[PDB]
Amino acid sequence: MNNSSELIAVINGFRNSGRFCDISIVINDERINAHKLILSGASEYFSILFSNNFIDSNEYEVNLSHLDYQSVNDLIDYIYGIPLSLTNDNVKYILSTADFLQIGSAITECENYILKNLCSKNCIDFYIYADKYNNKKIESASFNTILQNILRLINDENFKYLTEESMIKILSDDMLNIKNEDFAPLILIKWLESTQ
Amino acid sequence: MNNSSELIAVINGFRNSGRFCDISIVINDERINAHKLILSGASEYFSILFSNNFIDSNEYEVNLSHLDYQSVNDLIDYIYGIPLSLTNDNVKYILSTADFLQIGSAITECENYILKNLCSKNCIDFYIYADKYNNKKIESASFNTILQNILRLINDENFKYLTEESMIKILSDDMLNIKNEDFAPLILIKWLESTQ
Amino acid sequence: TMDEKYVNSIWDLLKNAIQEIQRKNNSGLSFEELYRNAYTMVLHKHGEKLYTGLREVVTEHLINKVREDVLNSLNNNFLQTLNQAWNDHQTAMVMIRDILMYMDRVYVQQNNVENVYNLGLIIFRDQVVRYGCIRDHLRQTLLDMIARERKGEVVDRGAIRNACQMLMILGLEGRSVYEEDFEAPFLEMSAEFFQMESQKFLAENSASVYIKKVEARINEEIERVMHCLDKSTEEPIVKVVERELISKHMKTIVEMENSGLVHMLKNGKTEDLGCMYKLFSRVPNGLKTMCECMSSYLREQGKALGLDDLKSRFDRFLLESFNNDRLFKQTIAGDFEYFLNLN
Amino acid sequence: TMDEKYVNSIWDLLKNAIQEIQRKNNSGLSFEELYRNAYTMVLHKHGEKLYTGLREVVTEHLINKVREDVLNSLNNNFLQTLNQAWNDHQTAMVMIRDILMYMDRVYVQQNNVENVYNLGLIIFRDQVVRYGCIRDHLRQTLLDMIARERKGEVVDRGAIRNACQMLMILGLEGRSVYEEDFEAPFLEMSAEFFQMESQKFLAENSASVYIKKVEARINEEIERVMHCLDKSTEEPIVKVVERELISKHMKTIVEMENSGLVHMLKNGKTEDLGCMYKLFSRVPNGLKTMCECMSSYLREQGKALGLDDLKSRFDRFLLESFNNDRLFKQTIAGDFEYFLNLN
């Protein structure tokens, strides 16, 4: 039998109790107590951090104030025996933090959720996100989902946030789902009306 | 997805490397390096040991010379991502050590293997074992398997090791698989001939 | 017998250790060494001496020391001394279960007896908490604090919270101790208070003011349970409030001169009549009393009379105040069929 | 452009850090701070400056410092200095991959280029190990040590083991570097030694002694591979031993006067004839040569003769020495059918 799931539950029980905790994560004013070994196993950032090769290797406190608290907290819960409660609103921020901390187990679960739930109302927001965080995997997928719902998205609320360079990339050549071969200038008019 | 099996593999990788190891187990002249948190999660002996309530709580070395080395080593491997390679010869010693260290995950896997592989050639040895280690679960099962193979076991090699009190318990009342209602004194003769 | 003198000597080593944990001298105790002595004792079929011995040592400590410390504090910080005694017992029993863990996993499991934790709870319950003078004083202290808070005084809610949570745990995953020692005399004392307060409100307040005052007491008693007691007491106390203030005065509330149901139907106090419906729906025969008083007024007004003005008015009361109840609907419809029978 | 001067400045911070790791001054370097600079560089599509820059810094260190340290040690502890340079490069590249981890997980993954570890191996291979004078000296040092050990001298096997394991890793999960730089001239040098040793043994030893001496050399060359080289060299060296000592002298070994196969068949040296069968089975046309020489002797003896004595003797050789081979069986049976044809 496999007792890996039973063992992690006792370790998570020790984490809540404060037992064996040899590391603390500080995000502005919030504190999360965990174990050096557990964080190093799932996240490669902590593995390279506690490698005894740098000045920051032998410390009790780690400052990660530039990252979202609820994102970091849920990611530590994911490292432990708690499954990730993925929702369309938080997945955007959980992926960014997982990409920085380089956790393979969480980066895949977030990407798979985004690709699966890539709707017409979502794709418009996920493209600008992947264009900022250099995620070419989601950047290409959100672009394809925008192109197949182009005439539905020109009237959408999030259409104003799309950059000038992004508009050129969309109209550039082909694959844009337009039945009439004269919709392209009308799409440009709607963008110039929404952005002003 | 569940990444509990992936996480324990990295922790076992750190264990072999010597990373985060804050405890050492000494058996006569042999040494096993592990983590305080991992041993406390599966074995309740280490959990009560590293509880900060005793003099032995804050130490780097634990002396367990009264236990079998290969048994302790394989049990630590069982606490980590390595499955227990159970065989009729080592299961006798792995259960004894697992009972002392009070590991629930290993005590069940060993008992289930003993009950499953309880043959006529095995039961005779497992009874004397359970009579010494006060294991009433296997003691009753080995007794039933001896009683159903009584006439086959009177000629067996391990028959001489059965105590006088054990012989009285077997012949005491019923359940002994004997077709003729006059085999009981002949069984006593074979015991007095084997033990002399 | 060698072992009859040897096992009695190995027990004396474990007996001294348990006594050291009771004195909070666990700091200089070796777990490794003490565990082996308990391990060897269980393996050699001498678990009876260890278990019977454990009961006798814990009993000695809770009678001679713990019981006397509580009895010598009956007048000064009683609840604080009893709670400290409870916390010290819990801390001691965990470390006692820690060194005698092999007995707690092998002996008590196959012999089918109470574990170290449960055994400690039984002795602390029978010899301290349920002990004569302490049991009476705990009941008298807790009931007085609730009686003082109801008058308008400030009491230590946390001390009541700790004492109630102690009585719940001592029931061994049950409420038998909390019910007998606290809940039963609490509901008996409360009923006496609610009945006297009912008599006051019926003489110094209006029927409309009374209904709103009962709702205020229902919400006040829910707060006391959630903050000071166990939440399983929420339903039993609400039922006592409902019985003493509504059920025992159902006919009285509706028959109040220039304030009751008849007065509300005349003046057309829609939202005020709805408050009566919300309160009387809680108790049995509550809405039945409201219907009987309504039918008494409706039948007399239809007898005096034209009739389309009464049906329009009573339909407005049915939908807005009585939340379109089928009992109230058949009462109105039944009374209008009676007026057609007259002529 | 601001960023054309800003990104060049943020790179100078990372450039100084990589140079500090190369000097083994990693002790006072902050991972947290250095990781953010590489993280911001990759996110802002400036990974090209970081990757091209990394190659140029590593190239600078391995040409100006590492290459010169090896070239200045060609006469004193060459293998020790080269192995130290190899270990220092491996330790530096791990910590370089450590601070530039975000580039190693995002940039090289989506742009499909070599990782920090593989990039370091290419530059260390092309600029140090495969560099003109070092490449020639490494080949001349390793081959001399093997040539000395074959003569009966004691050599540093561990230094050969480390140098061979270095050449295997530099092939990027392949043996291309080890084969070209070491294996090919090794098999060429060995073949020259085995042929000269063959000429010695054929003049100073018997055919029976020769076969046992070849087996001794086969087992000696297997030991050298297992202890000093890569185990993939086991088959290529054994084949060289087999070709130079057996294949090139097949007819010579069996035709040895008063020592060969004919002499063994006359004297009936069963176990000694079996040794020839075990050695000749390794090479193609080996057992064919043994059969042709056996048929030449068997046909002449049957011609001279009665015949039942020859068949009984040759059946004893077939089962005991020739392990009941079907080729040897049809040769004996075919020769006895020829004697029946004579008369």
Author numbering:
A (entry chain A), B (entry chain A): 1 to 196
C (entry chain B), D (entry chain B): 24 to 328, 344 to 381
What text appears in the publication on this structure?
A55 is an intracellular protein encoded by the A55R gene of VACV. In this study, we showed that A55 binds directly to Cul3 and solved the crystal structure of a complex between Cul3–NTD and the BTB-BACK (BB) domain of A55.
To understand the molecular basis of this tight interaction, the crystal structure of the A55BB/Cul3NΔ22 complex was determined using anisotropic diffraction data extending to 2.3 Å (with an observation/parameter ratio equivalent to that of an isotropic 2.8 Å resolution structure). Consistent with the SEC-MALS analysis, a heterotetramer of A55BB(M)/Cul3NΔ22 can be observed by applying crystallographic 2-fold symmetry. A55BB dimerization is mediated by the BTB domain, where the N-terminal helix (α1) forms a domain-swapped interaction with the symmetry-related molecule. The A55-binding interface of Cul3–NTD is formed primarily of residues in helices α2 and α5, with extra contacts from the α1–α2 loop and from the C terminus of α3. Residues at the Cul3-binding interface of A55BB are primarily found in the BTB domain with additional contacts in the three-box region; the BACK domain does not contribute to the interaction.
